[PDB]
Design an enzyme around this catalytic site. Sequence first.
Site, PDB file in Angstrom:
ATOM      1  N   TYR A 288       0.835  -1.193   0.000  1.00  0.00           N
ATOM      2  CA  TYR A 288       0.000   0.000   0.000  1.00  0.00           C
ATOM      3  C   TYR A 288       0.873   1.246   0.000  1.00  0.00           C
ATOM      4  O   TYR A 288       1.624   1.488   0.948  1.00  0.00           O
ATOM      5  CB  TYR A 288      -0.964  -0.028   1.182  1.00  0.00           C
ATOM      6  CG  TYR A 288      -1.776  -1.301   1.132  1.00  0.00           C
ATOM      7  CD1 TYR A 288      -1.747  -2.221   2.178  1.00  0.00           C
ATOM      8  CD2 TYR A 288      -2.523  -1.619  -0.003  1.00  0.00           C
ATOM      9  CE1 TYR A 288      -2.478  -3.406   2.109  1.00  0.00           C
ATOM     10  CE2 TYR A 288      -3.256  -2.801  -0.078  1.00  0.00           C
ATOM     11  CZ  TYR A 288      -3.226  -3.690   0.974  1.00  0.00           C
ATOM     12  OH  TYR A 288      -3.952  -4.862   0.880  1.00  0.00           O
ATOM     13  N   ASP A 290       0.528   4.424   0.838  1.00  0.00           N
ATOM     14  CA  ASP A 290      -0.463   5.231   1.538  1.00  0.00           C
ATOM     15  C   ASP A 290      -0.451   6.666   1.033  1.00  0.00           C
ATOM     16  O   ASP A 290      -1.509   7.294   0.917  1.00  0.00           O
ATOM     17  CB  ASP A 290      -0.224   5.171   3.053  1.00  0.00           C
ATOM     18  CG  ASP A 290      -0.615   3.819   3.656  1.00  0.00           C
ATOM     19  OD1 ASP A 290      -1.476   3.112   3.068  1.00  0.00           O
ATOM     20  OD2 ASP A 290      -0.065   3.463   4.721  1.00  0.00           O
ATOM     21  N   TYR A 294      -3.346   6.547  -2.019  1.00  0.00           N
ATOM     22  CA  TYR A 294      -4.525   6.918  -1.239  1.00  0.00           C
ATOM     23  C   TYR A 294      -4.605   8.395  -0.881  1.00  0.00           C
ATOM     24  O   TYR A 294      -5.713   8.883  -0.640  1.00  0.00           O
ATOM     25  CB  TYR A 294      -4.593   6.095   0.061  1.00  0.00           C
ATOM     26  CG  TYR A 294      -4.981   4.640  -0.151  1.00  0.00           C
ATOM     27  CD1 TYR A 294      -6.316   4.253  -0.148  1.00  0.00           C
ATOM     28  CD2 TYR A 294      -4.009   3.657  -0.356  1.00  0.00           C
ATOM     29  CE1 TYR A 294      -6.689   2.928  -0.333  1.00  0.00           C
ATOM     30  CE2 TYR A 294      -4.374   2.322  -0.549  1.00  0.00           C
ATOM     31  CZ  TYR A 294      -5.714   1.972  -0.531  1.00  0.00           C
ATOM     32  OH  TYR A 294      -6.089   0.663  -0.715  1.00  0.00           O
ATOM     33  N   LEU A 295      -3.467   9.105  -0.838  1.00  0.00           N
ATOM     34  CA  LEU A 295      -3.326  10.521  -0.487  1.00  0.00           C
ATOM     35  C   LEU A 295      -3.557  10.758   1.008  1.00  0.00           C
ATOM     36  O   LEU A 295      -4.701  10.902   1.452  1.00  0.00           O
ATOM     37  CB  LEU A 295      -4.265  11.411  -1.308  1.00  0.00           C
ATOM     38  CG  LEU A 295      -4.321  11.179  -2.823  1.00  0.00           C
ATOM     39  CD1 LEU A 295      -5.211  12.226  -3.498  1.00  0.00           C
ATOM     40  CD2 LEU A 295      -2.926  11.143  -3.447  1.00  0.00           C
ATOM     41  N   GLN A 298      -5.760  13.842   2.575  1.00  0.00           N
ATOM     42  CA  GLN A 298      -7.213  13.973   2.576  1.00  0.00           C
ATOM     43  C   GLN A 298      -7.867  13.242   3.733  1.00  0.00           C
ATOM     44  O   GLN A 298      -9.045  13.476   3.986  1.00  0.00           O
ATOM     45  CB  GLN A 298      -7.826  13.493   1.265  1.00  0.00           C
ATOM     46  CG  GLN A 298      -7.923  12.018   1.082  1.00  0.00           C
ATOM     47  CD  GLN A 298      -8.560  11.662  -0.246  1.00  0.00           C
ATOM     48  OE1 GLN A 298      -9.618  12.182  -0.607  1.00  0.00           O
ATOM     49  NE2 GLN A 298      -7.904  10.790  -0.992  1.00  0.00           N
ATOM     50  N   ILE A 371      -5.694   5.800   7.429  1.00  0.00           N
ATOM     51  CA  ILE A 371      -5.885   5.098   6.151  1.00  0.00           C
ATOM     52  C   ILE A 371      -6.286   3.668   6.483  1.00  0.00           C
ATOM     53  O   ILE A 371      -5.422   2.838   6.778  1.00  0.00           O
ATOM     54  CB  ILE A 371      -4.626   5.100   5.277  1.00  0.00           C
ATOM     55  CG1 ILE A 371      -3.987   6.487   5.183  1.00  0.00           C
ATOM     56  CG2 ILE A 371      -4.957   4.552   3.894  1.00  0.00           C
ATOM     57  CD1 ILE A 371      -4.689   7.398   4.250  1.00  0.00           C
ATOM     58  N   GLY A 372      -7.583   3.372   6.428  1.00  0.00           N
ATOM     59  CA  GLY A 372      -8.086   2.058   6.790  1.00  0.00           C
ATOM     60  C   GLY A 372      -7.751   1.669   8.221  1.00  0.00           C
ATOM     61  O   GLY A 372      -8.230   2.297   9.173  1.00  0.00           O
ATOM     62  N   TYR A 374      -4.616   1.718   9.509  1.00  0.00           N
ATOM     63  CA  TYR A 374      -3.454   2.474   9.968  1.00  0.00           C
ATOM     64  C   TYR A 374      -3.818   3.881  10.428  1.00  0.00           C
ATOM     65  O   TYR A 374      -4.652   4.579   9.862  1.00  0.00           O
ATOM     66  CB  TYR A 374      -2.326   2.738   8.920  1.00  0.00           C
ATOM     67  CG  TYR A 374      -2.040   1.632   7.953  1.00  0.00           C
ATOM     68  CD1 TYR A 374      -1.359   0.482   8.377  1.00  0.00           C
ATOM     69  CD2 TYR A 374      -2.420   1.717   6.610  1.00  0.00           C
ATOM     70  CE1 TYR A 374      -1.086  -0.584   7.497  1.00  0.00           C
ATOM     71  CE2 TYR A 374      -2.169   0.687   5.681  1.00  0.00           C
ATOM     72  CZ  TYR A 374      -1.477  -0.473   6.148  1.00  0.00           C
ATOM     73  OH  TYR A 374      -1.178  -1.550   5.341  1.00  0.00           O
TER      74      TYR A 374
END
Lengths: 620, 620
Positions: A288, A290, A294-295, A298, A371-372, A374
């Site tokens: 991933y 991240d 995924y940025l 944001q 992020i999810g 994390y």
Amino acid sequence: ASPFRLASAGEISEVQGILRTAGLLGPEKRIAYLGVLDPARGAGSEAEDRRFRVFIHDVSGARPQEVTVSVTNGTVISAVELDTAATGELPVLEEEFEVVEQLLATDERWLKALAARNLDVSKVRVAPLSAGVFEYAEERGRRILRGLAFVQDFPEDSAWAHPVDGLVAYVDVVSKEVTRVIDTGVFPVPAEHGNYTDPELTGPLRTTQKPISITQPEGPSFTVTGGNHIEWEKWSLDVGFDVREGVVLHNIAFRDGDRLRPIINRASIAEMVVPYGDPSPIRSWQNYFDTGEYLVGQYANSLELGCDCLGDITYLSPVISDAFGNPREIRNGICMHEEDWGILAKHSDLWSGINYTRRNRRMVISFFTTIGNYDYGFYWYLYLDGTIEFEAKATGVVFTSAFPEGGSDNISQLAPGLGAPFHQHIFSARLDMAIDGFTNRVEEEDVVRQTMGPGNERGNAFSRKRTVLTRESEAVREADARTGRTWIISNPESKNRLNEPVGYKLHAHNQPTLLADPGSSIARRAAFATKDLWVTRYADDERYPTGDFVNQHSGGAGLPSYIAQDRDIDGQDIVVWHTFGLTHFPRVEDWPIMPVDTVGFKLRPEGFFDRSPVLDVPAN
Amino acid sequence: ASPFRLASAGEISEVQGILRTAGLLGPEKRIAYLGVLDPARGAGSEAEDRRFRVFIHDVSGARPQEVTVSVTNGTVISAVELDTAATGELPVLEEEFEVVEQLLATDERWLKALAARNLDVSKVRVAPLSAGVFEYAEERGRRILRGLAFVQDFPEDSAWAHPVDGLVAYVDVVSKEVTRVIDTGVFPVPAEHGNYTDPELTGPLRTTQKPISITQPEGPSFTVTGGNHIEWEKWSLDVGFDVREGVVLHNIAFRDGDRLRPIINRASIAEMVVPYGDPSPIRSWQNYFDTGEYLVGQYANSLELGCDCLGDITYLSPVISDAFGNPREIRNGICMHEEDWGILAKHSDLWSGINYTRRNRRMVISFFTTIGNYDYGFYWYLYLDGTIEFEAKATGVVFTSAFPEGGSDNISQLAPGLGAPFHQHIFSARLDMAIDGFTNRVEEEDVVRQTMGPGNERGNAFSRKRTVLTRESEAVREADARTGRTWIISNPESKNRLNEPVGYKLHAHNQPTLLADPGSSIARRAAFATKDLWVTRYADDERYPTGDFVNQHSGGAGLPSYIAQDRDIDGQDIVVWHTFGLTHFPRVEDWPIMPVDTVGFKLRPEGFFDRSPVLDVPAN
Ligand SMILES: [Cu+2]
Ligand SMILES: [Cu+2]
Ligand code: NA
Ligand code: NA
Ligand code: NA
Ligand code: NA
């Protein structure tokens, strides 16, 4: 007035208007990235031009576009259609997070796999996971997400405690097609819950912690002007925010007497990747990015006073774009405060009789992202003595799997039947250096051991050596903790009072770099992560170590392609890219929610000043 | 009641009386060391016997003695005359600090050397420097100090700014004889002052620092009972103080539910050495065992509230003996307080909707010592999550020399004509381990990289390996940062709920170890410093890695002689000795007084608990 000011809601609304009027923002369009562009080099002209870069996705299958807009003038500067099979897919959209689960919920193969496990489809969460590039030829040029399943027993349950192993699905999120469902066998779903707010699991809460009160009776010692310009204890800088990179520091300078001396032009975490080391086909594709996919900006959290940030806190609330070009504020997204940091300098002298003690402090600039599973804290520190430090704080919930009967060489057991695959969290710091100006060079410094003999009769001497890196082709360096290896960034045209070039020394933590086989997909896509230090010549378009479009990009982009230009870096405008990471073998203590672990780096002055820069600190 | 209580003034007065009555403390005697002995293993009998170990010097040339006394019973237990040529000289006495200067001031060769340099003898300070063992046969069995000279222009001047290079003298401090005066040539005495409180050098003091107020409205969360027993946030320990080692931690344990679980029986910094890397004959003999030769505990500073220790501080004032056996209190010598330590754990979950944040804190136990030019802070930290950390803070004034015309490979320039020789500061932590009891073993853990191929088709797998150290002969280990090497101390007879042995992981900083040639005198006398980790079987008399009498001891003593016994350490009562150090190439910013630099290590639970130990921490 300042070109480095944060984007305003009005600017983002103007970008939206410019895009729509140009026909670029129809109902099938989504903004996947929007950010302000830094000023070009040598912008000594007050002709300020605020420009924005936009990545535009099309949900109907039309080609995405990259677009540059000038808000000061109100025009589209350029608009390019992207061939994503060539240059990569756009970053994952927040609105695609739910699409994977919803598409699988009506696929007969997915339903068949859930039925064999007696799982109610309404309780099965599916994580929206970036796909990478592997053996599947049908994925080239298609926008793919992969899904792994976790059971929620009830709406407030932690799904991470209940992984559904042996099952993975691939989905085309534009055509809304489930391309593959892979079921390698039934694993028991781990049954223990992981609800860290359940009293049955926490037991009674401690009543032994007495409060710690941190206050500043006269307010903080730093000032904020123009929205985001900081002055603190001779430091000067601008705090930027980008939806991909997060907090970005600009124009870090130190006021030495009457001179404002630049140190770093731009500092950011330009990429971060989480590669997993489990060879099971259910998970062996997991890497991933991240930041790039995924940025991280944001998903910045709103930080709560007294909980996330303690003390006399000054907040910034950065503005970003949503998928339709509307401005959205991240309330209390950046914390800034100063902290006491113990003893700065101390001496009691046996001959002069003078006793001397001074205290240190540091300025903290931080944000937190999720992020999810994390959660990461990004912390920048500025110290009284000229030291600059970055620290990443990793927490959240570990990504789980089943723990196989008979054990695993690549997975830790956390609870009965519950595993956590080995992985790394690897960061890339991009430091656009400006030590006393833009003419900089990098030297590698090693300790030198000397043999006992003539000129060293007692065998006690040791020395050091410095090697200048002159060309990009020789500026890909590895750590060597045993030889005390560090790197010095100096300005050969700016000398201290001893006629030595001024400099700053980079101290790494010397953690392992990317562990994957050099022939793997991830070694090619995250080539930056295989070496500790890279130095490039500055160029406007060389922003990220992985290139502009990381998602499903085949590899090679970014740093390996930049350094092939083999440009002169000996007394030139240069950029240092430092790789640093955590290698995570999960332990039982990481479950059900993980205590913070940290990694970072620091830079310390090395003959930058003519003597200690903190002689004028008062006695407290 | 507690056998681990600090020595009282009454106990030291009783030792004095017992010694004098036995004829052991006549007017020619000096106590060079006095300390309480720890209880022997298996002291499950309330028969408390407080015993003290004493090193007695004789200023008339008679043999020194080592003496053990029981204060509870009032007897001499044993008294042994020491052959110092065999087993080493006694530690340097505080009253010998001035003797070197006074003896040289009437030596015609010394006066001749000062006259050639036009230096007034009344302004020349001479540092009392430990001698080591080199080529001078006349020094064997004599008590020698060496002297290097520094000029004080006036009583409050920093003499360190004015080294007198090219000149060294050796003195026999018992016979009061100057054995050798070596003059290799005239160097200019650097003329700039280094007075860091002189306004002409500091400039006007900053007025920009606003106060930071740290208070605890309800008092601290820890309790102190029996003088030195600490309970804090499930931790339990006893804080000891020894004049050689300084702060010593005993009986570190963690209250896990209803069970008090031991972790470490005794933790201390058992040696520290500062080897210099300048091959000039004026300085090539310099290696200061600040702990073993000078005794860091006797120079502990009195710490001032609001300056040295900030917040709600609880002090201990340890009692030591002076040279005549009188008790002397070190007022406010130990600071203890708790500190906020940022985020402990944090997660915002996309599926459960729960947002969770908890803050960390640490308990701090610290003291500061001053040895000539050096000042060192010793900090022990206990964290909520089970982590134990040590940090050394090095400050003070760098040891100086002339800077040679034409430069040096072994000396940094700090000011016109002023140099600072390269050196290291190397520590030895002695950790008498007791992970859930005394049956412990050490495993070395390396990251394992795997080749792409069958069973690892995508080349992403990585693993780890653990190697049990079974015998002392194989338990001398080096760091390997590139393979992520750590060491696990576990109890093979105590298992967590997953049936895995409980353990703690030692994380080193992986700094360079001793740089000197392996054939040098210092490599033989500080053999511990050549390797990062040693494991021995516990024995009552194996206290220091360098042996009991370090001063002028020829070498071999300590750890190399202990491990030759090749004892079983696989599930036994074991002691871990960790070497860690700073390699100091002085920079201009270190002058005229050095900002703190740090080094340390930490231990983290590794399957010690059945899940995170901080689930019961409340929401702040
Ligand atoms: Cu992790
Ligand atoms: Cu030093
Ligand atoms: Na491609
Ligand atoms: Na640059
Ligand atoms: Na000997
Ligand atoms: Na032990």
